[PDB]
Ligand binder design. Structure first.
Ligand SMILES: [Zn+2]
Ligand SMILES: [Zn+2]
Ligand SMILES: [Zn+2]
Ligand SMILES: [Zn+2]
Lengths: 409, 405
């Protein structure tokens, strides 16, 4: 049967906050963060703590052949594919206490709440922590979910080596979490709760980010060539200054992105004058460009505008410019129907809410290309507030219940 | 009545000296007080003795060749530059002026000319400031700007002291550096494009620029490139780019004498998907006048403050080096001008854009320089080498006076 959002079934927010505090002990760093690098001893301790909690909540727990960790709560429909709630327990070298872990433990609290309420779903529920989401110890990021969706072959993943030469397969064996089951399988829908990792919801007082998808991204390398002449002997009209040229190109980029507001973004994150000295005009300048938009055609349009603009600047200043695209990633829309469940849950509770794009990668990005996917963002300051943690999980709970259905209560 | 030098002879002396320390790329490496610097010093000294001169070193290795005049009590007219080089030096920088002095003497010998005041040729120790700091070390000791004992204690990258290196070179003299000088002349390639572009043979060098070296640091917020919408950003790199264009505008308001250059710049702790939160760059500011270069600096401080306020970032501007303008002596400069006009060579007044021993000498001794053009900035044409030395000879002889001929 159908869930009623207007019943406003709520979680135990204090219980979820305590589980976050307890998990943040595992790998706690001197600065107050968390280090559980994928498949290290501290990652295993976090996986094991989570698995224990899941089994105490009546779930069965297993790992697949790349270490993806699944907890299962059967529904009344023995044949139905599960509604999957996921994120990741692994961290960066100096990770925050909410990145990744919030969405995994939100799933656990969803189950603990269903247990407390005596609710049996129609479709089964599963909670997943994906292996090596962070891409720090092993490449790539979102390794476990990429293997699950078929984007990364299993044998290629098992052979990835960390900086010490250890293979991921060897690390799975050391972890004790190499399952025998091939990764993959039918999924009805995938939901992921996560902190925003950006300032929008906190700045607006918005409790719920209704996540629409991920951006189209381009990474560019720019090199500007001039003449590296002496700073004192060369009068200004003789100069072919690659750094003043690069500076004007940066401001052209700022103007191009302003023309694509609000969805277009651009960032020059690396830049340098090569073979540089204080009293030598720059003859060789490199910088990188990160370009974003909601749409691939529009981010490509921004790129072509930048190439045109830089060509014009270079011709006016007598320098040369080369622009190479070294990485592309497509926009990744989420499923309209699953996104609508997130919105409806937020509206039923009266929580402030806004549509927002995911500005960074998540396992949800990989899942969305294969199965109906939505995300719940909460604001963050790294830190999140207890009532935002609670209310985001209330939204997750009720969107998942709407999707999975309620068989009995 | 114009005496002309032997240009082919001068050209061959430059070719022969460029063999000493020749590099695989066809340049020259004679780092100060290394074995190849010693071999260049010794070759020059031999040529000077073959030309009848006496040669000595002072207590910091400055190398002096002397041609007496008829007036035994007069201070000398000194022709100088340097034989040492950068790690990858050119075949004319420094050496041209030293070997022009030698050709001056050879031409006076050929003509049988006795001057009134004596002439000396000098190659100053460690002009380049590469192996030991500072640049112009030998001329700085000579003028008293750098104490001798401080100079001798300077260490290179391997920890060797300059005094130890003089001892290894065999060129630690016993005489305290310094002494009366009537005038100092230095010939040098321009190291810039002006004379060649203008078709000007002789640069009548007016002196040195006022220079400021600034360190700029711009601080923003290093937020994620995808999660941070544009209105939330405090982007230190876009801010620094706008400051650079403000600087370009300020210097255009001080044309033609004001110059500015950002030669070093980078985003620190940088990543492609992170907004720049910490950007540093350097500024080299020049003018003919200290008050004007100071005005450009204060204009830049005002402009950068305004940019930072508009963009929500912070900016800090520190001065790490200042050097004052250094005008040359009116009379010696005019002797260069008159020599160029006597020969009918094209000529223009020009500031020295780079440091030379002449800069140090000008603060204690009446000083002038002769610039010649650079090809297309390290090579010079044979006729320019010749004509610059003709001008040097005429100016030096006018200063030293002719006793007999
Ligand atoms: Zn993360
Ligand atoms: Zn995460
Ligand atoms: Zn030089
Ligand atoms: Zn030089």
């Amino acid at each position: 049967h159908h869930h009623h959002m207007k019943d406003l079934l709520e979680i135990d927010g204090a219980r979820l906050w305590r589980s976050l505090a307890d998990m943040a002990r595992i790998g706690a760093t001197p600065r107050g963060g968390v280090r559980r690098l994928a498949l290290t001893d501290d990652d295993r301790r976090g996986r094991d703590l989570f698995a224990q909690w899941c089994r105490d909540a009546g779930m069965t727990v297993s790992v697949d052949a790349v270490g993806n960790l699944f907890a299962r709560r059967d529904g009344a429909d023995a044949q139905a594919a599960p509604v999957l709630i996921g994120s990741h327990l692994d961290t960066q070298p100096e990770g925050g206490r909410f990145d990744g872990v919030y969405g995994v433990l939100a799933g656990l609290e969803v189950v603990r709440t269903l247990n407390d309420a005596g609710i049996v779903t129609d479709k089964p529920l599963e909670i997943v922590s994906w292996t090596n989401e962070e891409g720090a110890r092993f490449a790539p990021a979102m390794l476990g979910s990429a293997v699950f969706t078929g984007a990364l072959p299993l044998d290629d993943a098992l052979a990835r080596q960390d900086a010490e030469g250890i293979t991921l397969g060897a690390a799975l064996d050391a972890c004790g979490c190499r399952g025998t089951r091939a990764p993959g399988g039918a999924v009805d829908a995938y939901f992921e709760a996560h902190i925003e990792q950006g300032p929008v919801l906190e700045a607006n007082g918005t409790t719920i980010g209704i996540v629409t998808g991920g951006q189209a991204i381009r990474w560019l390398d720019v090199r500007v060539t001039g003449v590296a002449a002496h700073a004192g002997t060369t009068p200004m009209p003789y100069r072919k200054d690659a750094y003043f040229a690069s500076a004007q190109m940066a401001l052209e980029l700022e103007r191009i992105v302003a023309g694509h507001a609000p969805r277009g973004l651009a960032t020059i994150g690396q830049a340098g004058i090569r073979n540089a000295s204080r009293n030598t005009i720059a003859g060789d300048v490199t910088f990188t460009v990160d370009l974003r938009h909601h749409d691939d055609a529009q981010v490509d349009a921004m790129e072509r505008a930048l190439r045109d603009a830089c060509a014009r600047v270079a011709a006016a200043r007598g320098v040369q410019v080369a622009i190479d695209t070294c990485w592309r990633s497509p926009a990744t829309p989420f499923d309209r129907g699953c996104v609508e469940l997130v919105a409806r849950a937020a509206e039923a509770f009266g929580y402030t809410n806004e549509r927002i794009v995911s500005g960074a990668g998540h396992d949800a990005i990989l899942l969305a290309r294969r199965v109906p996917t939505a995300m719940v963002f909460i604001p963050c300051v790294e830190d999140a507030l207890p009532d935002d943690v609670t209310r985001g999980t209330n939204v997750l709970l009720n969107a998942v219940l709407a999707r999975a259905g309620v068989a009995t209560r």
